[PDB]
Design an enzyme around this catalytic site. Structure first.
Site, mmCIF file in Angstrom:
data_model
loop_
_atom_site.group_PDB
_atom_site.id
_atom_site.type_symbol
_atom_site.label_atom_id
_atom_site.label_comp_id
_atom_site.label_asym_id
_atom_site.label_seq_id
_atom_site.Cartn_x
_atom_site.Cartn_y
_atom_site.Cartn_z
ATOM 1 N N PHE A 121 0.863 -1.203 0.000
ATOM 2 C CA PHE A 121 0.000 0.000 0.000
ATOM 3 C C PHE A 121 0.884 1.233 0.000
ATOM 4 O O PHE A 121 1.680 1.405 0.908
ATOM 5 C CB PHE A 121 -0.922 -0.023 1.226
ATOM 6 C CG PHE A 121 -1.852 1.169 1.250
ATOM 7 C CD1 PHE A 121 -1.409 2.387 1.785
ATOM 8 C CD2 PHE A 121 -3.121 1.075 0.706
ATOM 9 C CE1 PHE A 121 -2.234 3.499 1.763
ATOM 10 C CE2 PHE A 121 -3.951 2.194 0.685
ATOM 11 C CZ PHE A 121 -3.496 3.397 1.192
ATOM 12 N N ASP A 123 9.459 2.818 1.225
ATOM 13 C CA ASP A 123 8.309 3.613 1.735
ATOM 14 C C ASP A 123 8.236 3.403 3.218
ATOM 15 O O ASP A 123 7.769 2.342 3.637
ATOM 16 C CB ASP A 123 7.029 3.132 1.049
ATOM 17 C CG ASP A 123 5.773 3.846 1.573
ATOM 18 O OD1 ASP A 123 5.854 4.502 2.622
ATOM 19 O OD2 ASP A 123 4.773 3.739 0.858
ATOM 20 N N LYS A 163 2.941 10.600 8.237
ATOM 21 C CA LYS A 163 2.269 10.069 9.454
ATOM 22 C C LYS A 163 2.964 10.519 10.708
ATOM 23 O O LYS A 163 2.856 11.692 11.044
ATOM 24 C CB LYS A 163 2.126 8.525 9.390
ATOM 25 C CG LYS A 163 1.033 8.140 8.398
ATOM 26 C CD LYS A 163 0.807 6.664 8.498
ATOM 27 C CE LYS A 163 -0.064 6.077 7.420
ATOM 28 N NZ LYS A 163 -1.488 6.023 7.805
ATOM 29 N N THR A 215 2.368 23.945 -4.483
ATOM 30 C CA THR A 215 2.181 25.208 -3.764
ATOM 31 C C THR A 215 2.850 25.269 -2.424
ATOM 32 O O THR A 215 3.550 26.197 -2.115
ATOM 33 C CB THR A 215 0.667 25.465 -3.604
ATOM 34 O OG1 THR A 215 0.056 25.500 -4.909
ATOM 35 C CG2 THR A 215 0.448 26.805 -2.893
#
Ligand SMILES: Cc1ncc(COP(=O)(O)O)c(CNC2=C(C(=O)O)C[C@H](C(=O)O)C2)c1O
Ligand SMILES: Cc1ncc(COP(=O)(O)O)c(CNC2=C(C(=O)O)C[C@H](C(=O)O)C2)c1O
Ligand code: FES
Lengths: 461, 461
Positions: free
Chosen positions: A179, A288, A319, A343
C-alpha cells in the site's frame, strides 16, 4: 500526563457519536467513521470520545500520532507568542521560505537522515511523497539515458500532449499486498484490497510477489528461505520482461513491513538481496517508510535493521513525522527547478511540531522504549497464541509494530468490537489480522494492561 | 492591519537571503527560491524579507493567502486556549473526526456551497482534490454502466493486478494550457509548460484547445464567438473519437480562468455551452477552482459569474480556502466507504482558520471590494497599455485576477525583477505574461501604489 486506565460509560459508538454520524452522513458517505472524539480531553495513549468513554488507543490515528494526545511539550509550543506567525502565515515554501526554514530542518528531519542520503524535499502527505519520489526516479533514469544533453525539440513538443518520447513508458515495480497511497500514480503500485482499486484507471507496471512467511519461524526456516528466494527470482524475471516490453523498470518500491496489506514481514536478508537486485539492474530503490518510520520498530527508520551503508536511493515518510517528504541520494537531485514542485510542499507549522517531537524521542530514549515495550507486547501475544490456538495464529512483529491473525474476518471484527467496548482500540489489517500501532509513549505497563484485558476477552469468547 | 507603502533597503534577494539560499541549496535544488521571508513582521498586503525589505505583495504565495499576512482575527484564534488541541492533535478524519467537525464545516465550507452540490469531501491540497474528483467520477461512470449489477468476479480479480475490466481504460478530457496539479493523474490533465511534464509517464487522454481571445474584446466580437465555437466543436469530436477508441471520456475538467498556462479567459457563454456538451455525452463536468476560488473575481466562486443553477457536477478548491476538497452532486456520492479515503483528509486546524476567514470576507464585504479594487487596477493597466504599447498588450482581468502580456520572456522577467527592487512582488504565467493575485485585503489605494511605481519603471525602461 497519563490517565490510569481506560474508563467506559457506554457502548461505542454511543448515542452522541451516533447523532453526529447521522449529521455527517448527510454531506458525505460516513460509513467508515468509528466514533467522534473529544481531543481536548484526550491525553497520552488515551482517546476520549464524545460519550465520555476513555479508551487505550493502540491504533493512534492509523499510526500517525507520534508522542500521544495533548503532549505538554507541544501545548507549550502553541502557547509561545513567537510561534503564532507559523500557524497563520502559510508560505509557498518552494519560492518564499521563512527565515528559519533551514535551521528548523536541521533541528528535525536532517538530524535523522538515513545513511547515504544527503538530499531532502518536504511534502504534505504520504501519497504526494511517493508520487514525487516516482517522478524524481523517472527524471533520474532519463538523465542516465540522455544527459548531459539538452531536452530534444521532439521531447519538449510531445510531453505537452502526453506522448512519447517526452512522456516515457517507464514503470515502477511494486509488490502484491503493498500500500503506497491512493492518488493515481501511488494507486498503480498499491495492491491491498479490491475496494481500493476497482473502477480506477491504472498503469501496466510489474507486480511481484511479496514473501508469505510460515509461522512459527523457528519451525519453517528452510521453507521461508525458499519462499523469499522464489520471490527474489520473480522480481528479477519481471525486470527483464518489462525491459523487453519497452516498459523499462526505473524503480522498485517496497515497505519494510507491509501494513495495510496485512502486516507482512520478510527477513533482513530478503531486503538486502532485493536492494542488490535493484542496483544490479539500474533500478532506483524506493523504500516507503510512511508507516514504519518514526521509531516504533525500535530504530528510527525500520530499514536500519538491514544494517546497510547504502540501504536505498530514495526513502519517503509521513504520518508520525507530521510532515511528509523524501530523503534521497545526491545523484537523484533534480537538475532544474519546477520539476518537483507544488504550492505548499508541506507546512512549516508541522516542522515546528516535528522538531519538538524529535527532541522528546531523543531526550526520553523512546526508540529503546519501543523495543522494550514491544518485546513485552509480543511475548504476551505469543503466550495468548499458545493458550488460544483456535483464535490466535501467526503472531509476529518488530518493536510495537505487532500483529496476529484470527480464523476469519467475522471473528476479527467481533474481537475488535468487543475490545473497543472494553476500553481498547485496535486496528484491523488485511482480511483477518489484528494490528498494533501504539504511540511512542506506549510503555510496559500499557502492554500489560492490554494483555490482561484481552486475556479476559478470550476466556469469555 | 497594514503598513502605509513599501520600504526598500536592499536589492532583492539581499545579502541575508543569498546566504540562506546557499545553505538550502546544499540539501535540495533551491533555484526556484525568490528570497527568504520574515513572516512575523509581514502584515496585510506587505511581505517583509530577511534583509528588512517591505514589499507590496501582489502574488500572495501563489494566490493562497486569503486575508493578508498576520491578520489579527487569525492571531486571536491561535491565542485562544480552547484551540490548542486542534493544532497538536491531528485526527484521521475519515474514521475519528473531532466533536465539532460538522459544525465547523457549517461555519465554513458548507456556508459557501456551490449551487446544486449537497456533498462535500475535504482534502489537504489541490492535487489530491483533483485526483479524488477524477476517482469519484470514474466510480460514478462505472456505476452508471453496471448498476444495479454488483462488482463482477472478473472485475474484483483484475483490479488487483492493474488490468481491465477491474481497471477501466476511461479518460478525463482536459484543455491545452491547463494546470490541475502535478501528481501523476493530475499531471496528465496539465498542459502548462514542458518543464512540468517532461520525462514523466502519462495517460493517453483527450486534449482540447482552450479559446484564445483577441483583445480588445470590443473589436473582435465575431472572431471571439467563432473561436469559442471552434473549441466547443473540437471538444465534442474528441469525446466521440475517444468513445470509439474504447477510452470513454468519463469527465471533463476545466478552470474558469486558466492560470499557470497564461491567464486565459473565455466567455461565460462558452462555459455554459461546455457544461451542456458534458451533460449531453454523459461526462461529469468538473470545475477546478483551486486558484479562482475564494473571492478575487468578485464572486466567491468564479463559476458563479456564469449564472447557472446547475453549473457543474464536481468542483475542487484549495489555496485561499486553506484546506482542499471538492463539492459534488448527490448522484456522485461513493456507494461504499474506503474508496475515496486517505489518512488525514485535510486538517481541522485549517477549517478553524477558514471559518474565521469566511466571517471576515462577509463582514468586510470583501467580494465587492475585490470587484472594485480590481476595476481600479484594470483601468490603470489599460492606461499603461495605451501609454506603453511597446511593452504592454492584451490587458485583461475579472476582479483582481488581472494580467497582461509583455513582448518576450526576457522582458517579462526583467520587469518583475525591477518591480521587486522597487517594492512590488509580481507573478508570471505562460511564456511572457505578468499576473496579479492580490490578497482579499488589497484595496483601491494599493492598486494606485502599484500603478504609480510601475509607471515610473516603464518610463525608465
Ligand atoms: C506505507 C504507506 N504509504 C503511503 C501511505 C499514504 O499516506 P497518505 O494517507 O496519503 O498520507 C500510507 C497511508 N496509510 C494508510 C492506510 C494503511 O494502513 C489506510 C489509509 C487509506 O488510505 O486507506 C492510509 C502508508 O501506510
Ligand atoms: C488551478 C489549479 N489546480 C490545481 C492546483 C494544484 O494545487 P496544489 O499545488 O497541489 O496544492 C493548482 C496549484 N497551482 C500552482 C501553480 C499555478 O499557478 C504553480 C504551482 C506549481 O505546482 O507549479 C502550483 C492550481 O492553480
Ligand atoms: S497529495 Fe499530499 S496533501 Fe494533497
Amino acid at each position: 500526563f497519563d490517565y490510569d486506565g481506560p474508563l467506559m460509560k457506554t457502548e461505542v459508538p454511543g448515542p452522541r457519536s451516533r447523532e453526529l454520524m447521522k449529521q455527517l452522513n448527510i454531506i458525505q458517505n460516513a460509513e467508515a467513521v468509528h466514533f467522534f472524539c473529544n481531543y481536548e480531553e484526550s491525553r497520552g495513549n488515551y482517546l476520549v470520545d464524545v460519550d465520555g468513554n476513555r479508551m487505550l488507543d493502540l491504533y493512534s490515528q492509523i499510526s500517525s500520532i507520534p508522542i500521544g494526545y495533548s503532549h505538554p511539550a507541544l501545548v507549550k509550543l502553541v502557547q509561545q507568542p513567537q510561534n503564532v506567525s507559523t500557524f497563520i502565515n502559510r508560505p509557498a515554501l518552494g519560492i518564499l521560505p521563512p527565515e528559519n526554514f533551514v535551521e528548523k530542518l536541521r533541528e528535525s528531519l536532517l538530524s535523522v537522515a538515513p545513511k547515504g542520503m544527503s538530499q531532502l524535499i518536504t511534502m504534505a502527505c504520504g501519497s504526494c511523497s511517493n508520487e514525487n519520489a516516482f517522478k524524481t526516479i523517472f527524471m533520474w533514469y532519463r538523465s542516465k539515458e540522455r544527459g548531459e544533453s539538452a531536452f530534444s525539440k521532439e521531447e519538449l513538443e510531445t510531453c505537452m500532449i502526453n506522448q512519447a518520447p517526452g512522456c516515457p513508458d517507464y514503470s515502477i515495480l511494486s509488490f502484491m499486498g503493498a500500500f503506497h497511497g491512493r492518488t493515481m500514480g501511488c494507486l498503480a503500485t498499491t495492491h491491498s484490497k479490491a475496494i481500493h482499486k476497482i473502477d480506477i484507471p491504472s498503469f501496466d507496471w510489474p507486480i511481484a510477489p511479496f514473501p508469505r512467511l510460515k509461522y512459527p519461524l523457528e519451525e519453517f526456516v528452510k521453507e521461508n528461505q525458499q519462499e523469499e528466494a522464489r520471490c527474489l527470482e520473480e522480481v528479477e524475471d519481471l525486470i527483464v520482461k518489462y525491459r523487453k516490453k519497452k516498459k523499462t523498470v526505473a524503480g522498485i518500491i517496497v515497505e519494510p513491513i507491509q501494513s495495510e496489506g496485512g502486516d507482512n514481514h520478510a527477513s533482513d536478508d530478503f531486503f538486502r538481496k532485493l536492494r542488490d537486485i535493484s542496483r544490479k539492474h539500474g533500478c532506483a530503490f524506493l523504500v516507503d517508510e510512511v508507516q514504519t518510520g518514526g521509531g516504533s520498530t525500535g530504530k528510527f527508520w525500520a530499514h536500519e535493521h538491514w544494517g546497510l551503508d547504502d540501504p536505498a536511493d530514495v526513502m519517503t515518510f509521513s504520518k508520525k513525522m507530521m510532515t511528509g517528504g523524501f530523503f534521497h541520494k545526491e545523484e537523484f537531485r533534480p537538475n532544474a527547478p519546477y520539476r518537483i514542485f507544488n504550492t505548499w510542499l508541506g507546512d512549516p507549522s508541522k516542522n515546528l511540531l516535528l522538531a519538538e517531537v524529535i527532541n522528546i524521542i531523543k531526550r526520553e530514549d523512546l526508540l529503546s522504549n519501543a523495543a522494550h515495550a514491544g518485546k513485552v507486547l509480543l511475548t504476551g501475544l505469543l503466550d495468548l497464541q499458545a493458550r488460544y490456538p483456535q483464535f490466535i495464529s501467526r503472531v509476529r512483529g518488530r518493536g510495537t509494530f505487532c500483529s496476529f491473525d484470527t480464523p476469519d474476518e467475522s471473528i476479527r471484527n467481533k474481537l475488535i468490537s468487543i475490545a473497543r467496548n472494553k476500553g481498547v482500540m485496535l486496528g484491523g489489517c488485511g482480511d483477518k489480522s489484528i494490528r498494533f500501532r501504539p504511540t511512542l509513549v506506549f510503555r510496559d505497563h500499557h502492554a500489560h494492561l492490554f494483555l490482561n484485558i484481552f486475556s479476559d476477552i478470550l476466556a469469555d469468547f
